[PDB]
From Swiss-Prot:
NCBIfam families: small_GTP
Protein's name in the database: GTPase KRas
PTM comment, free text: Acetylation at Lys-104 prevents interaction with guanine nucleotide exchange factors (GEFs).
Effect the entry attributes to changing Q61H: In lung carcinoma
Phenotypic consequence of G60R: In CFC2; characterized by a defective GTPase-activating protein sensitivity and a strongly reduced interaction with effectors
Outcome reported for the amino acid change (mutating Y40A): Decreased interaction with MAPKAP1/SIN1
Gene that produces this protein: KRAS
Amino acid sequence: STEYKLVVVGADGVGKSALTIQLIQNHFVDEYDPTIEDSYRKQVVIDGETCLLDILDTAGQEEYSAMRDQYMRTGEGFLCVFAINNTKSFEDIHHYREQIKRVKDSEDVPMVLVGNKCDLPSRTVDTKQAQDLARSYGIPFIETSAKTRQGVDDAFYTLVREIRKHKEKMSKDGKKKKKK
Ligand SMILES: Nc1nc2c(ncn2[C@@H]2O[C@H](COP(=O)(O)OP(=O)(O)OP(O)(O)=S)[C@@H](O)[C@H]2O)c(=O)[nH]1
Ligand SMILES: [Mg+2]
């Protein structure tokens, strides 16, 4: 019943498309297929509510600062994905977060930090640093492997939960109005 607009963001090659295709299609693309902009719908039951997910799988490839704006205005929550063997992709999260906060003109934007490719050896981004970054941001951190499907549903369902929490918070706000 309730629709949630989710946007999967992050550097090229982190696994945004692999995560999203696991969620929607239940298989893993070993392939490379760089994304311009694909979207997907899926009907899910999360905490006993039916949810219509409308998911945008974005381009990691850059230039943008053109393209990012409209889908940042549109998105209700953001899956901020880095790959655990890609230091720059982790560092990129700060910049995506800043951009989203600026473009949506809010300090309060539902987000989940996703460390993908946890099936691989010799990670270059430690779990502790990701956890520490998420704690700073006051957002969940979930480790995934699109290859094995580990954590995939949890990552997307947790983002829906963050949106719901935000919706409830915004009704009560901090002040000005109040509600519940
Ligand atoms: N080992 C491993 N490989 C993965 C995982 N997720 C994605 N990959 C691989 O990484 C490569 C890039 O994945 P892809 O999903 O296309 O990245 P992207 O983030 O969507 O990249 P883009 O569209 O912005 S350019 C592919 O070869 C894919 O199979 C994972 O969890 N584990
Ligand atoms: Mg892609």
